[PDB]
Design a protein around this nucleic acid. Sequence first.
RNA 1: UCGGCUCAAGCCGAUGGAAGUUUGAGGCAAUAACAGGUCUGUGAUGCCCUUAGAUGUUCUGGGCCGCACGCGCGCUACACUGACAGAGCCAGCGAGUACUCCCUUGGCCGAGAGGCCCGGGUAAUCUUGUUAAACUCUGUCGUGCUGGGGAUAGAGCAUUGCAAUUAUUGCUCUUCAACGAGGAAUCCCUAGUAAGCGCAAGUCAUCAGCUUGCGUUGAUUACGUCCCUGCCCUUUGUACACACC
Lengths: 69, 199, 137, 52, 142, 103, 138
Amino acid sequence: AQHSVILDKATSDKLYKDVQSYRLVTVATLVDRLKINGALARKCLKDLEEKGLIRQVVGHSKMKIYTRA
Amino acid sequence: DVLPKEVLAEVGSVKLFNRWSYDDIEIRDISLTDYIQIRAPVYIPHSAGRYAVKRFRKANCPIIERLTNSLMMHGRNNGKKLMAVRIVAHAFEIIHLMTDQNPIQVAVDAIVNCGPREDSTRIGSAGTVRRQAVDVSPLRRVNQAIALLTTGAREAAFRNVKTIAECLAEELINAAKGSSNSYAIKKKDELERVAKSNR
Amino acid sequence: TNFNHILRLLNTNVDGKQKVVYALTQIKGVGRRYSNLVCKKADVDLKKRAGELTSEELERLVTIIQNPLAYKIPTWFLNRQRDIVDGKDSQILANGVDSKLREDLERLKKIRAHRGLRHYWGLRVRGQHTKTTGRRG
Amino acid sequence: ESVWNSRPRTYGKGSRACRVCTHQAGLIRKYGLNICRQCFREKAADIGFVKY
Amino acid sequence: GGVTVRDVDAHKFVAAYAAFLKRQGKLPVPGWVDTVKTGNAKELPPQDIDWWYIRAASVARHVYLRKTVGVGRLRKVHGSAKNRGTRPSHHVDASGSVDRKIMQALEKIQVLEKDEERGGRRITQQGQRDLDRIAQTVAEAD
Amino acid sequence: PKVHKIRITLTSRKVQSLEKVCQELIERAKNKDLRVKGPVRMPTKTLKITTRKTPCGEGSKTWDAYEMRIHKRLIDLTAPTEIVKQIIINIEAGVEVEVTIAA
Amino acid sequence: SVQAVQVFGKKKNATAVARCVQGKGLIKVNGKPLKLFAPEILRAKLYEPILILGTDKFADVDIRIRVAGGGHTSQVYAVRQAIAKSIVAYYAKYVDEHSKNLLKQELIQFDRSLLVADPRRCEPKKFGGRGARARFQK
RNA sequence: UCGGCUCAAGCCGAUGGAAGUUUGAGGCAAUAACAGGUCUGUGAUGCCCUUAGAUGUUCUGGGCCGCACGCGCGCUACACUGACAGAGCCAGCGAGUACUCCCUUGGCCGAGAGGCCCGGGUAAUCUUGUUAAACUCUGUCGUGCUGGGGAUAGAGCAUUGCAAUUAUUGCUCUUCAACGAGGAAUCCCUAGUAAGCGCAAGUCAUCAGCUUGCGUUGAUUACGUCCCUGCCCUUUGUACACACC
Ligand SMILES: [Mg+2]
Ligand SMILES: [Mg+2]
Ligand SMILES: [Mg+2]
Ligand SMILES: [Mg+2]
Ligand SMILES: [Mg+2]
Ligand SMILES: [Mg+2]
Ligand SMILES: [Zn+2]
């Protein structure tokens, strides 16, 4: 039930080789299959948005959704 | 100047919803038309209509607001159309990405396939039931189909880490085909089966 | 990797997966407001969990906890006055609130006041209705 | 000896009463009537109270 | 063309003027920050550090839109509901000292002046010129 | 003969008498070559009172609401002080009049 | 002289008075521009009387409106009702009706409510809205 | 005015019109009655009783709130369709100054509750634009009975009243229970309606979880029938008339 608040290399490696194939990436998806905390998931959205691999479709203060580029 | 640059792209063309068009409507069956109203497009579902004065005024009415109205239930969600319209629009945006087809293209097939065709009627028998297994009218079929989708989304999202934004979205794509793993189908097959037994 | 998902401050265990400001709230005798003040006045970033801090700053928080008034905080914000006939301010902690709660009962019992007698019998001390309240004995 | 009514009565109930017949329970003082509701109803019409 | 206060969104504008006032960085503080409740109905202090600066700036925005306003009006403008427990909620006003001193300090910055002829505080000639200059700084920034 | 800009205030419970009072006053005043200002229409003042209809409390609980309406109908004139004395004569019952010099 | 027309719109408790003056194509609402004075998602419910008609027909019209009373959706319904009457009154009074008739027919076939108001108010009762108190044993 | 029925009585829809469902909702509302309620509203009232050791009046103190338990009318809740933090910002009906201060602007002091100083209003003029709540945008928290939930109790600071203990109430810190949509049973309701949310008035020196009204946002399904629980007219049966208890 409890998730991980820190991201290690064991979780880092799945991202940079898997996010190229997801159709949607959301906080629910990360807490679902990455087995990570929601706050860490939201951070994972924001650090990865600026590196230039995903594009914004709709933005809001409660939930945000991202897709492929 | 007086119009936003986003809407200036579509204003030149025929009037439609900004994100998605209303053209290329399904050709799948009959007997459900004349009760789903699409001849008059509407930009946003919200509207203060006069459809609750006579019997069949709801037959000539845009579908999207009816879904918004059925989406808000269970005490707490009374009067929040500002919240409902955004949630429904986001649900159409979410379902648009998993399938290149129009969100209304998927939604119409979703409603037309999850409607029960038979139901059991209650006839008194002094403690027993003379269930006659009557058929269901198309208007009641669509009216109950909307209810099943909305209560399915509310039940699924209740006490779950998922949010209703994509929780509502997933049923429309699930119900688009004969997946048989949705709540609406769970109620639908039980109703025809009990009618089949009680014929 | 020094992220130890367990901490031990003042005879109690706290978690490290959750935030620093609410980490201190786990120990008895402190609420959200006091934790907010001490975490802001200790110059600690709120965006990290309680496990991501280092050793040296950990003690100066509990030093503030034991001696509140020496770091320019108001007197009304504390949780103790009039220890005896002449009293001073204090900020009591987890084991302190538990220890301090009992003795006030038999002291006022010794003076034998009505409120203490109500305490002694176990019946409700504050005057309150009873036709639909406390139906457990 | 003349302290038999030393209690002051300028404070809530007891310092006011109905005009027609002395009474102190449920007296309306709004809009300066100071009359009981029971005494009020028979003499309402003449004062000018009506329905619409 | 020329732009004014009405030509910009209020929410993004207030953030821009808070960033602009960062660069001057001179408004007296009596140390009340991080200790005040900011309102009886409220329960937690604001997380963001420059809440005192966005609030002082917001007070100047509403005084810019009203002709005469006092501490009582700002007292009840920023109030909200309070969870009294098992009782139904009501409407109560925010703290008085924070809102009074946050705009008392705003006098000496040459933003608004007294209105002793009839009461309250009004906006001054050169005070409006700052928000007017920032109107063009933000309008064509788009 | 110094003009004082008179103003007279009216109050009553019934409504029909006041209208004809102003109707006769305006004609009584125009013919003397006096500058007259119109009969402005002041808001009506509605008052409500709620009390229990029953006197004992037995049976079902039902209430009734009495109500009352008031009209003001202000009028003003520009004239000296002595002239209005003979212009405000012949008033009937019910209507009360209050005079203000407004000097 | 100067070309101008006055209109007003009403709702349950929202009054929106409008002044239409011959101008150059400027639209401002309650002082604020059209970008601001609305809830974010309902801002669309402001542009339909313009987009359905065309911006080219707003060449020399200026409108100033003051609205008060009611709620947010009452105010937006008042302004959307007032715009249609302002434009049709200005065209009817000051220019040939060849435009006016097509504007009126096309607009009312899209939505009839632009020219008529919807009457809805509350009814007082002695127990609340329409429901009574709970009964003991029926 | 017109269409589709009928000789007639009458019903449904459209155009002008906001409307034609009697436009919507109210006030008043038949004969004969109940061993219904009130002598504790009345200087309305028969008879009986105590009337100076008074059941009259009045002063002090306490009680009507006292608690192993069953029942009713209500309020906050069981969370992500959520909580928290900043910003954006929309009503109506009403009330206010005496032989003593009644609603209260502005200024200063004050964490907060509060305190001090000028001033307006016997009131479409001032309070009051009552810029209320809901709601909207931007962030934090992340399903854990946890930052949902606030019962219980300690310490400190204030206003009201002659008097606050069994605290009248308010404010600050801390204590952090039960409660995962609730059994057999059961109530209300047809469009600005249900529900969600607040405001004004009453009782009031102070206290609303109460009532009477006012406003914001505003829904799913039906436009039927007499099946249960009841009502109306006629025919019919009776050994019932205090009338199927
Ligand atoms: Mg009512
Ligand atoms: Mg009758
Ligand atoms: Mg006696
Ligand atoms: Mg807890
Ligand atoms: Mg009250
Ligand atoms: Mg027989
Ligand atoms: Zn009386």
